[PDB]
Symmetry: D4
Subunit: 159 residues, 8 copies
Amino acid sequence: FEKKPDFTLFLQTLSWEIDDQVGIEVRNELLREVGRGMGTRIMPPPCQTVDKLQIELNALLALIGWGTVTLELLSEDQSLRIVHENLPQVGSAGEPSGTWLAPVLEGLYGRWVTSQAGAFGDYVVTRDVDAEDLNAVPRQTIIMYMRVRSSATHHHHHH
Amino acid sequence: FEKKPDFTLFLQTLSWEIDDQVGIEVRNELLREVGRGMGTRIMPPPCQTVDKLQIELNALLALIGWGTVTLELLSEDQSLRIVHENLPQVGSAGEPSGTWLAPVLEGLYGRWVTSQAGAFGDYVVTRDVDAEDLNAVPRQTIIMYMRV
Amino acid sequence: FEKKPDFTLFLQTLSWEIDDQVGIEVRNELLREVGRGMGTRIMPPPCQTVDKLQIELNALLALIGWGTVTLELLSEDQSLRIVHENLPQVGSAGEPSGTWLAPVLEGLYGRWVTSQAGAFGDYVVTRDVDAEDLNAVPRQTIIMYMRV
Amino acid sequence: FEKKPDFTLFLQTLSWEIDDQVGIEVRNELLREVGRGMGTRIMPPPCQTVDKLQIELNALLALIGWGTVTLELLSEDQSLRIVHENLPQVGSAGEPSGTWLAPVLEGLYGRWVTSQAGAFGDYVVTRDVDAEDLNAVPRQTIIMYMRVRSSATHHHHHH
Amino acid sequence: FEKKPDFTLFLQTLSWEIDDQVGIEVRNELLREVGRGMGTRIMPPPCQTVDKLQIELNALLALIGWGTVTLELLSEDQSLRIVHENLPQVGSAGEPSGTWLAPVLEGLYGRWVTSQAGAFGDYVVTRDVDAEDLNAVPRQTIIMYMRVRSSATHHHHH
Amino acid sequence: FEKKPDFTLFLQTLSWEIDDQVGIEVRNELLREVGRGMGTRIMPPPCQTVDKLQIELNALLALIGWGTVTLELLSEDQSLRIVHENLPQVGSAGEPSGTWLAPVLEGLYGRWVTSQAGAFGDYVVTRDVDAEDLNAVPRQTIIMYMRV
Amino acid sequence: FEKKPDFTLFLQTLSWEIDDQVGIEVRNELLREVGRGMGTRIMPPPCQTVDKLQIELNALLALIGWGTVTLELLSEDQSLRIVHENLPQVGSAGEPSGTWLAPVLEGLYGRWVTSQAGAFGDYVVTRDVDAEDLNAVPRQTIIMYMRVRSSATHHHHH
Amino acid sequence: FEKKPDFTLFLQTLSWEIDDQVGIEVRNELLREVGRGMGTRIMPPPCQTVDKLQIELNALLALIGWGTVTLELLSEDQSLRIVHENLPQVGSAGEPSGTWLAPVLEGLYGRWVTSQAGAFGDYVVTRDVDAEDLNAVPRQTIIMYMRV
Ligand SMILES: OC[C@H]1O[C@@H](O[C@H]2[C@H](O)[C@@H](O)[C@H](O[C@H]3[C@H](O)[C@@H](O)[C@H](O[C@H]4[C@H](O)[C@@H](O)[C@H](O[C@H]5[C@H](O)[C@@H](O)[C@H](O)O[C@@H]5CO)O[C@@H]4CO)O[C@@H]3CO)O[C@@H]2CO)[C@H](O)[C@@H](O)[C@@H]1O
Ligand SMILES: OC[C@H]1O[C@@H](O[C@H]2[C@H](O)[C@@H](O)[C@H](O[C@H]3[C@H](O)[C@@H](O)[C@H](O[C@H]4[C@H](O)[C@@H](O)[C@H](O[C@H]5[C@H](O)[C@@H](O)[C@H](O)O[C@@H]5CO)O[C@@H]4CO)O[C@@H]3CO)O[C@@H]2CO)[C@H](O)[C@@H](O)[C@@H]1O
Ligand SMILES: OC[C@H]1O[C@@H](O[C@H]2[C@H](O)[C@@H](O)[C@H](O[C@H]3[C@H](O)[C@@H](O)[C@H](O[C@H]4[C@H](O)[C@@H](O)[C@H](O[C@H]5[C@H](O)[C@@H](O)[C@H](O)O[C@@H]5CO)O[C@@H]4CO)O[C@@H]3CO)O[C@@H]2CO)[C@H](O)[C@@H](O)[C@@H]1O
Ligand SMILES: OC[C@H]1O[C@@H](O[C@H]2[C@H](O)[C@@H](O)[C@H](O[C@H]3[C@H](O)[C@@H](O)[C@H](O[C@H]4[C@H](O)[C@@H](O)[C@H](O[C@H]5[C@H](O)[C@@H](O)[C@H](O)O[C@@H]5CO)O[C@@H]4CO)O[C@@H]3CO)O[C@@H]2CO)[C@H](O)[C@@H](O)[C@@H]1O
């Protein structure tokens, strides 16, 4: 036969449909879940330094051509900063536009750096969405932060 | 020369996630809708014969490298058998296993043939064998009918 | 894995043959029409912002690997500058040499932006610099305006 | 940048437009001319046997991925039979549908086998379009005949 | 740049080097371990039927281009035969010549098939290596079986 | 994911030029010498068995994509039959046409095989260019013998 | 099958073989002839301006992936300089090392530029080969000039 | 126009397995021996000048796509500086991470260079793994020396 099939247009019209029907919020949660899932299908070994983890992670991202990543350990607060380039673009959906697949990275990365034996054991992944940084960086560049889960206040425990 | 992103592992986990959360029926209507959606994005010209229509449809399928299709007219009803080969496979989801994307076709062909706002245009698509059993048919061969 | 046919030597001789027989003006209207034609075959969704529109247009251009485009709104008229990079080149035909396919874009963008049957939709495209001189602009960069 | 651009959809909508405006006849003549032209841009050396010419011709067709060809010298009348597979399909135009580019082959081949020093010096190329043969063979398979130009009768000389 | 590096020449000579130093037994255990290792880096989701697992595994194999596979539930032993096409050839090493990487599949399939929660924990994968089963199928075809592990009393030594 | 230059048209003209200026006979020695020299640049390891040698030679062949080979060790007298499939074809030069590159294999195989420890060290290579076992085999299939 | 054969290893050793037997002069004439030959098999259409010819030639070069070229009309000599990027390298042969196929371009450009009906009949192509013109540009860059041929009276010998 | 298998993930697991079971020190000899052995299988012709040797080595390097090399013949004492760019990276193994394959080049270059007639026959290869000329050079750039 021939070189295998194209899923952009599909994802283009899928993302549109899902957006049409579901909150920005609902969609993102579905999309993180899918990230977690992706991270359980493919994973790095147990790396001993962030630097090694980075090489390992890029290796994985190259399996599927989903771009490149840099990991900077911000020792001064002990957070981990995830800077990911060329998130695949699937049409104009997402905030900002072109960036719909972003929360998959959140799922994918949280699954990946948590799998890391003991180190970033119970961290959480926030995406950075602050204005100033987003137009310092290109469209498809996504900035995330990995920091340690602070637990809920009881005031919040009301769901 | 140059190459870029793949989406299939994503769809493997998406299909799964979706199926786990919504069920077969809701997932399928969603998938018909997306099928219809694509059909508004890329489309054939106004074809004069079923044969010509086939070519124009295969051209479009080639564009995204989803499979190939044979349209063939049925003299019983002016009904229309649609045989699609090599539907992209995205893991083991769907019924039968590996045909998760099948409703996209019902939607897609739903749009395309109706685009010919003439004889067909008041028509519908149904996706299984309408003997209601697909006989000796490869996985990734999806058989549909267009009628009314 | 597998690969197939190329059409560029054909277009080199076609462009030439056509130009030799019809002239610049008739060839160009023909080429706008074909531009429009493509625009009915493949098209974006109803975009809400000029930015979103850009992405959806680049997606389509990527589909056939004609170049890339930046749309940018002009606060003087709600006018619209269109900058298209890497128009396919098919030999030395056209003005400037190598831009034979340029009118296809006037036609194509003519269709696409009008598809947004709202603010634009009663608009027109004109293809040269409308300073009427393209300044320090690479060959295969085609600059157009959308107005009225 | 990236792998270079796709001309099918263009040709698809071009062939449609030209057909819309111009006779089947006018178009074919334009298309043969383009064939002649193509044959003047690329050409075989002077081959000494049809068999060699065939290898040479296929070589050229492979430059542009325009399919494969077989040449059988029909000694018994001294005509040359050209059987060409996978004429590139450009939409549904042409007679039969899918076959619009066929008369380019007529131009291309006549130019190619005529360039041949002295041998098929002043032959002409007819396409075979007879019903029976066309559905013995696939869509994109085109059958042509190269035979020696018989001159016009004066009765025909009235244009 | 240009589509990057080829590793066959590396493996042809790496396989030769290793074979020179090391018994064919030790080499196999090494290879089985890496196979078990590969299966930790890339895994299937939890499948409900063998058939699903087969689609799922083939999908994984496709990622790295290591051929295709067919699983077959043999209802009488509750054993499972694994027939794998087009193992990548890396020179003339292994038994038979060309199948050096076969022990890898043993580790790979063993990990993969086990990850499945259902029935399989404490199943072992062993390669079928028998005259006229090797003669019947092309050489880059590797045939394995998956049976339930048994344990051993007298059989404990050392 | 990128790509580079093509030498067929060149080699089509080269063979043509060469055959025109020097004989058929001296063209063939040239190519045998070249074939021999290629063999020095790329070479298999010390092979225990003929089966193993084959895999090894194919490895090398695959690496420059010059087709595939079969080695048949002949029982009756101490021969070694070499069947090479898919010799690169470089225009209509050679005999039969399109087989110009063939002596390269005489040189090439002559080298690889005699580099083999002790068993084959002192062998020759004539290509069996007989019509009887030719009108039956593909144009780009070349049949050789290792003997003495 | 799979995308077919690579000829560099052939040319590396063919170039070496030829160089061994034959003066570097004879080898060049041979190569120039094949270049003239290549230009008979693939040609530009009749161009009106140098610029058009440049688009047209680059188009031909693209067909076989033999690099890109820039032409430049030098108004004073009515001469024409041809600057060609990325000549395919085929081992270390030629002068300088790596440019063996350069004589080919001489034949190629000579044929191509001549096919143009206009001014050029009886123009000759000669390669520029001068210290610090070779040092200035990358090595797979070949610089040639195209001037009108002159003829010779005393200069006829043999 | 077709394509086949990938060994990176394998080699990611292999290095990992190997480093875990055998030392850093014995892993490196293994790889040097392998590198040496690769050098026997593929090899350049007898090179007149160091410049020529470079082109030749790159030719070989390109053939398996293991990156590019520079040879600097050192005047002060009789050294030969080897700078290899784009060593295939095979996971985070090695020191620095992702440079596991590096000793292969010690073996590889050690071989190719000493195969060279008379000038270099008796040389050694230690890779200058100094932080000073490392925190400046790319991770996949490897710097070696030929001496004695
Ligand atoms: O000649 C027979 C056949 O031709 C058809 O026309 C072309 C067709 O245009 C080509 O698509 C097809 O073959 C491959 C294409 O060369 C390649 O461009 C395509 O991959 C596209 C993909 O289709 C597209 O959805 C994707 O979108 C991008 C988005 O726009 C961006 O937002 C995002 O960032 O990136 C994605 C993906 O990169 O772009 C990719 C390009 O990477 O894959 C095709 C199949 O493998 O070739 C045909 C001919 O050569 C014509 O319509 C028919 O009439 C005819 O039968
Ligand atoms: O060498 C350094 C680098 O290597 C990485 O490993 C490889 C990796 O294995 C490759 O994926 C990658 O480059 C391309 C692959 O060659 C190609 O296989 C892949 O496309 C795959 C896709 O990844 C996969 O999801 C897809 O699944 C199929 C399903 O299994 C089926 O159900 C369905 O029917 O079809 C789909 C699609 O066909 O298969 C396709 C193959 O068509 O695309 C990759 C990018 O374009 O190359 C790497 C080598 O560079 C290694 O992980 C890294 O550590 C290391 O840095
Ligand atoms: O080896 C046996 C076989 O070899 C034949 O020679 C080559 C031949 O040179 C190749 O064309 C062919 O396979 C593909 C080519 O690698 C590729 O270059 C070609 O695509 C070309 C296209 O042919 C050409 O028209 C196009 O023109 C450009 C213009 O010049 C520019 O103005 C414009 O901007 O861009 C266009 C397009 O980019 O360039 C493209 C390159 O992108 O496609 C070929 C088929 O897919 O390989 C052969 C080797 O097999 C030789 O002739 C035979 O004798 C012999 O049998
Ligand atoms: O796995 C089975 C098989 O594997 C073999 O190993 C590889 C092999 O290394 C590859 O060559 C082969 O497939 C293609 C290669 O990916 C590609 O590099 C090659 O093209 C090479 C060409 O071979 C080489 O001569 C050429 O030389 C350059 C010069 O060095 C430069 O001076 C000059 O400027 O440029 C030329 C050419 O650009 O480089 C090109 C790269 O462009 O083509 C191969 C065939 O299409 O893949 C195999 C893996 O599948 C292994 O040896 C065998 O043991 C085994 O059977």
